[PDB]
Amino acid sequence: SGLDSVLPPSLYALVFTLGLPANLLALWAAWLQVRKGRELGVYLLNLSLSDLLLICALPPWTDYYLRRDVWGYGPGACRLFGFVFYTNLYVGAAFLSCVSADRYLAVAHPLRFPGARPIRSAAAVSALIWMLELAANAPPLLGEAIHRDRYNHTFCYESYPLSGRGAALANVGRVLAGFLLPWGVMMLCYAGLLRALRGSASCEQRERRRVRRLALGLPCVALLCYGPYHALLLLRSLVFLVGGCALEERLFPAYHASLALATLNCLADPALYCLACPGARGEVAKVV
């Protein structure tokens, strides 16, 4: 260790300093357009709620990392903190994918979507996603999560190395079903959105290009945030499932910097889905 005394501390500090008011503003904007029959607003609201949950769970981890990886809050509390953090981290990606699929359906099939009480179906899908992610992260909750090591760290909810192929398969599945399934759906939906309006007589070149930047570049932001973490996770899980203590000692600060860069997608979501959107930043621009 050694870099977790400074870097993830400062990223978490920036997140708790800016994203929390930003996520509150995005939540208010999303709720404002839920009132107007919209069914993008429910996904945006749930995304902002998940981001707020992760942001408020961040600073126990801030202390954790800035005190040279030590846990003193209690064996019971790290279960809850890791559960909230690692569940919001995947729920965010799921709801980005849902927003992408919703936009693709609305644009490519305008005369057939959404139509029939759009708030109810979207709320049902949101609840189903929450249930599925909660079930996915329940097996980690069943845990001996607090770990004492010889080298004066005493982690919780993490282990170096992994344990007996089990957490390794769990991590491989977590990667391939909480990322690259939602990210893959999001990328395909945005590509289909940008290919569906190839033929529209009304959209000019100026307003085709901004849709192009959004469709190819919002998934890029999501990947650039959530990607290094899951790539490193899959790398460790595959190496343990093909290295000794040298490999993990080499990619350890990479792993705990990729986690911070992954939680950095709690500033981008409120920004890219409230301020970048002209509609939201007409209502959520100055609460006072």
- Please give the helix or strand (H or E) that residue 211 lies within, else none: helix 205-215
Q: Which of 55, 58, 30, 54 is nearest to 44 (CA)?
A: 30
In angstroms, rounded to a whole number, what is the distance separating the alpha carbons of residues 206 and 264? 31
Spell out the domains of the chain, with CATH numbers in brackets: 7-282 (1.20.1070.10)
Q: Decide: helix, strand or coil at residue 82.
A: helix
In angstroms, rounded to a whole number, what is the distance separating the alpha carbons of residues 78 and 176? 25
Q: How far is CA 185 from CA 13, 27, 80, in A?
A: 32, 24, 30
The size of the chain, in residues, is 288
φ, ψ (nearest 5 deg) of residue 156: -135, 145
Q: Which residue has the tokens 């977790």?
A: 4
Q: Which of 49, 90, 52 is nearest to 182 (CA)?
A: 90
| Elucidation method | cryo-EM
In angstroms, rounded to a whole number, what is the distance separating the alpha carbons of residues 218 and 223? 9
